[PDB]
Design a protein around this ligand. Structure first.
Ligand SMILES: *Cc1cc2c(nc3c(=O)[nH]c(=O)nc-3n2C[C@H](O)[C@H](O)[C@H](O)COP(=O)(O)OP(=O)(O)OC[C@H]2O[C@@H](n3cnc4c(N)ncnc43)[C@H](O)[C@@H]2O)c(*)c1C
Ligand SMILES: *[C@@H]1O[C@H](CO)[C@@H](O[C@@H]2O[C@H](CO)[C@@H](O)[C@H](O)[C@H]2NC(C)=O)[C@H](O)[C@H]1NC(C)=O
Ligand SMILES: *[C@@H]1O[C@H](CO)[C@@H](O[C@@H]2O[C@H](CO)[C@@H](O)[C@H](O)[C@H]2NC(C)=O)[C@H](O)[C@H]1NC(C)=O
Ligand SMILES: *[C@@H]1O[C@H](CO)[C@@H](O)[C@H](O)[C@H]1NC(C)=O
Ligand SMILES: *[C@@H]1O[C@H](CO)[C@@H](O)[C@H](O)[C@H]1NC(C)=O
Ligand SMILES: *[C@@H]1O[C@H](CO)[C@@H](O)[C@H](O)[C@H]1NC(C)=O
Ligand SMILES: O[C@@H]1[C@@H](O)[C@@H](O)OC[C@H]1O
Ligand SMILES: O[C@@H]1[C@@H](O)[C@H](O)OC[C@H]1O
Ligand SMILES: O[C@@H]1[C@@H](O)[C@H](O)OC[C@H]1O
Ligand SMILES: O[C@@H]1[C@@H](O)[C@H](O)OC[C@H]1O
Length: 473
């Protein structure tokens, strides 16, 4: 087709439709949501990225970058058939400056590779998600929360600059002192404004020791959930969680527990966690001290950590939702708990809920000023919890299945004003229509995002079904 011929004349490497690598390059993380690209550009340099983008523009097809391919909605494939996919997985180099400790990171680098390089070379790190296979591209541009986030913020917070290919093939570098509107827009909604061709990340010195731990919670009836969660949110909201502690509730039908990573040794953790244990009347378990990389492997849930192989093909079949909420009124706790016990526990599929200890007075995430970036959820009291709701089938996902997580989210949102909840596009939920998605993902920052979108991508070359709409002018 015309896109193929354009790329060929432009000397852009591609994955041919009839090649073995098509299947690999085109394959979603979420097997529920395969899409067939118009074509797959396989850039080795920013020049190839520029050329691919221009080809899409000239030919008249949409284009999207695919970094790690982990979009829960397969938005790196375009979220529908027929886009040019700019597959970035051949560009995964990580360079660490020994002086400045600034890492130059190619946009197809996955988190496990980045973490390995930074640690092996200079015992450095930045704050990012768990999951070695996740691409830095989608992850860092929309937030990126992990077991260092209470201590050190989101992945997006470690970006110091980015080189970007715009919709018309122009190159720009975005930073606090250059293209500051774009730098703002990138840092929360970056899928909408161009293809980031290179990141620079600041780093922190990796702590010599981190301690993972668990606290099993007796959340087996509604009253226990309500009282437990009620205590937990009050503790968090009142500054109970120290900066070194990073923690979440993981719940499934068969067990509920807090899971933490404490940036310090086991004796320091025990002392730090005691007030919570007394409050919940609970016990610590599985206390394990680690070096930095072993801490990362602990929550990685993956054999391979330093992943760079283009054959990468981990996939699951699932539906997922997210939320960001304030503290929950007890009426909402009750509805959410009743849903958990009476509905979620009975669902005959592998589901889980994660409630991240996200905000509160000690969180690095919510110490970032409200004007710093387009990422919306920075208020230490209003943005207290981040949630992942995940509903996985082994075999085809049932078409009536969505009502399960949909109903659960309704139990929260029925009792919260729209100023007290949002959603998180790193757990992209294609159940939301375009209008709702923009609103819930970006909330108070949507209007400025729409203005920058009209300025940088007025033709919506980088369209996907939950992309920011250009402001009308
Ligand atoms: C599969 C998976 C996802 C996880 C895991 N753990 C996470 C965690 O511990 N914390 C989190 O906050 N998130 C976690 N996630 C979710 C991932 O954070 C999101 O799914 C990321 O958005 C995925 O990033 P990536 O793998 O790069 O996904 P893509 O599908 O390639 O892209 C998503 C989105 O971003 C755009 N995009 C990619 N690359 C670029 C560049 N270079 N420039 C602009 N825009 C880019 C894509 O077009 C698409 O829109 C654990 C697991 C197992
Ligand atoms: C990432 O880094 C490696 C080197 O660390 C680059 O490898 C070079 O590749 C070129 C051809 O592409 C060869 O001529 C050199 O011999 C390679 N050097 C080494 C030391 O192996 C690689 O090009 C870089 N990849 C990207 C995508 O930028
Ligand atoms: C490519 O797009 C960029 C961004 O939309 C254009 O650069 C802008 O040009 C306008 C009009 O001159 C200026 O007001 C903006 O300040 C520019 N923005 C930036 C970030 O530089 C650029 O003109 C476009 N190039 C072409 C050939 O159309
Ligand atoms: C602490 O970290 C060091 C490396 O920094 C590691 O070698 C050691 O085993 C760790 N200690 C424990 C108890 O895990
Ligand atoms: C819930 O379970 C606890 C035991 O964990 C029990 O004491 C309590 O009475 C139960 N509450 C209800 C309402 O069933
Ligand atoms: C644990 O860390 C503290 C610092 O918070 C330090 O004083 C103490 O020596 C450490 N304990 C061990 C066994 O390394
Ligand atoms: O509610 C129950 C759930 O919690 C789990 O134990 O599996 C059986 C279900 O009936
Ligand atoms: O463990 C992972 C969790 O950290 C992330 O939030 O969502 C995906 C899970 O696999
Ligand atoms: O460098 C910053 C760090 O000091 C803070 O803790 O988290 C946000 C980062 O941008
Ligand atoms: O029906 C919707 C489905 O098409 C989408 O993939 O996931 C959300 C569902 O509500």
């Amino acid at each position: 087709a015309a896109i193929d011929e354009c790329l060929k004349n432009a000397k852009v490497p591609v994955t041919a439709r009839n090649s073995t690598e098509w299947k690999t390059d085109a394959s979603p993380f979420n097997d529920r949501l395969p899409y067939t690209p118009a074509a797959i550009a396989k850039p080795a340099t920013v020049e190839h990225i520029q050329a691919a983008v221009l080809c899409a523009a000239e030919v008249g097809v949409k284009a999207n970058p695919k970094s790690g391919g982990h979009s829960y909605a397969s938005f790196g494939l375009g979220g529908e058939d027929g886009h040019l996919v700019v597959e970035l997985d051949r560009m995964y180099n990580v360079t660490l400056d020994p002086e400045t400790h600034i890492a130059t990171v190619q946009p197809g680098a996955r988190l496990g590779h980045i973490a390995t390089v930074l640690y092996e070379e200079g015992k450095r790190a930045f704050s990012h998600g768990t999951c070695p296979g996740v691409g830095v591209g989608g992850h860092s541009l929309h937030g990126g929360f992990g077991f260092s986030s209470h201590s050190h913020g989101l992945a997006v917070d470690w970006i110091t600059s980015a080189d970007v290919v715009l919709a018309n093939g122009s190159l720009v570098t975005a930073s606090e002192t250059e293209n500051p509107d774009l730098f703002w827009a990138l840092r929360g909604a970056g899928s909408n404004f161009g293809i980031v061709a290179s990141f620079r990340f600041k780093t922190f010195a990796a702590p010599p020791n981190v301690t993972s731990y668990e606290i099993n919670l007796p959340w087996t009836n509604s009253s226990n959930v309500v009282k437990g969660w009620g205590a937990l949110q009050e503790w968090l909201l009142n500054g109970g969680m120290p900066e070194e502690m990073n923690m979440r509730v993981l719940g499934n039908a068969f067990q509920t527990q807090l899971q933490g990573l404490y940036h310090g040794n086991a004796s320091a953790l025990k002392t730090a966690i005691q007030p919570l244990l007394a409050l919940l009347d609970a016990n610590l378990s599985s206390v394990q001290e680690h070096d930095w990389m072993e801490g990362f492997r602990h929550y990685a849930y993956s054999g391979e950590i330093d992943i760079t192989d283009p054959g990468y093909d981990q996939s699951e079949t699932f539906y997922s939702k997210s939320l960001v909420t304030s503290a929950l009124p007890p009426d909402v706790l009750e509805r959410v708990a009743e849903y958990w016990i009476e509905t979620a526990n009975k669902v005959r599929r592998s589901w889980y809920i994660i409630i991240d200890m996200y905000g509160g007075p000690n969180s690095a995430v919510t110490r970032v000023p409200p004007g710093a970036g387009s990422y919306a959820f920075r208020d230490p009291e209003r943005h207290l919890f981040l949630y992942e709701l995940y509903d996985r089938s082994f075999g085809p996902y049932p078409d009536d299945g969505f009502a399960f997580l949909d109903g659960w989210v309704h139990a929260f949102t029925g009792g919260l004003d729209s100023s007290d909840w949002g959603m998180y596009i790193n757990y992209a939920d294609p159940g939301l229509d375009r209008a709702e998605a923009q609103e819930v993902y970006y909330r108070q920052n949507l209007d400025r995002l729409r203005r920058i979108k009209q300025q940088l991508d007025p033709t919506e070359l980088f369209y996907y079904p939950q992309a920011v709409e250009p402001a009308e002018v």
